[PDB]
Amino acid sequence: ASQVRQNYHEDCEASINKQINMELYASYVYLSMAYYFERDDVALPGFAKFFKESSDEEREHAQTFMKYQNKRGGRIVLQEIAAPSMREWGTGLEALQAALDLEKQVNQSLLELHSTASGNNDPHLTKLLEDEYLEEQVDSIKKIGDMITKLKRAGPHGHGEYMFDKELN
């Protein structure tokens, strides 16, 4: 085995590889959304900026897990990254609703990975998930929830969507 590996269970190693793929998928969904909102017939630069930054964050989440895998002596296995579920995302509100669903699926996966770590008595891994991932996720879900509520108040279509979009820009 790896000269560094200690108290690192093969189920946790595999779970992190799966989570790496899921973070990359989320990054690619947000990339899709970002450029969707730069179409000449959509033209919502605030939403475009928001989802470009979210896409960058999700890739950084994947890279931190990849670093973590090496840190513990596990081995990174990269799998294909699925095409995003949609090619066109609808309104700003529909994109945020899609993002909220995705963030909660990722949160579900992170909490399941915490349970795996915890059942294998790996406090280094539960600590990683708590400090680096679980709060970022809860904060992100609250933020997107806030945005959905604000957009519904502002608009959520037409004039109000235009003005809300400037808030994000």
Known binding residues for Fe(3+) are: 23, 57-58, 61, 103, 136-137, 140
Q: What residue 41 binds from Fe ion, Ni ion, a copy of itself, none (CB within 5 to 8 A, per partner kind)?
A: a copy of itself
Q: What residue 58 binds from Fe ion, Ni ion, a copy of itself, none (CB within 5 to 8 A, per partner kind)?
A: Fe ion
- Residue 157: phi and psi, rounded to 5, are -110, 170
In the complex with Fe ion, the residue whose CB is nearer, 136 or 162, is 136
Binding-site residues from annotation for Fe cation: 23, 58, 61, 103, 137
Residue identified by tokens 């990339």 is 31
In the complex with Fe ion, the residue whose CB is nearer, 25 or 155, is 25
Q: How far is CA 90 from the centre of its chain?
A: 20
In the complex with a copy of itself, the residue whose CB is nearer, 5 or 11, is 5
Measured distance CA(138)–CA(28) in Å, rounded: 20
Q: What residue 18 binds from Ni ion, Fe ion, a copy of itself, none (CB within 5 to 8 A, per partner kind)?
A: none
Neighbour count for residue 82 (Cβ, 10 Å): 12
When binding is defined by CB under 5 A, the residue of 32, 61, 125, 151 that contacts Fe ion is: 61
DSSP state for residue 147 in the 8-state scheme: H
* Residue 145 engages Ni ion in binding (rule: CB under 5 A): no
In the complex with Fe ion, the residue whose CB is nearer, 117 or 155, is 117
Half-sphere exposure of 151 (CA within 13 A, CB side): 23
Tokens of 14: 């595999």
Q: What residue 23 binds from a copy of itself, Fe ion, Ni ion, none (CB within 5 to 8 A, per partner kind)?
A: Fe ion
* Residue 157 engages Ni ion in binding (rule: CB under 5 A): no
Measured distance CA(141)–CA(68) in Å, rounded: 24
Measured distance CA(109)–CA(103) in Å, rounded: 10
N- to C-terminal Cα distance for the chain?
A: 50
* Residue 161 engages Fe ion in binding (rule: CB under 5 A): no
Return residues touching Ni ion (CB under 5 A).
90
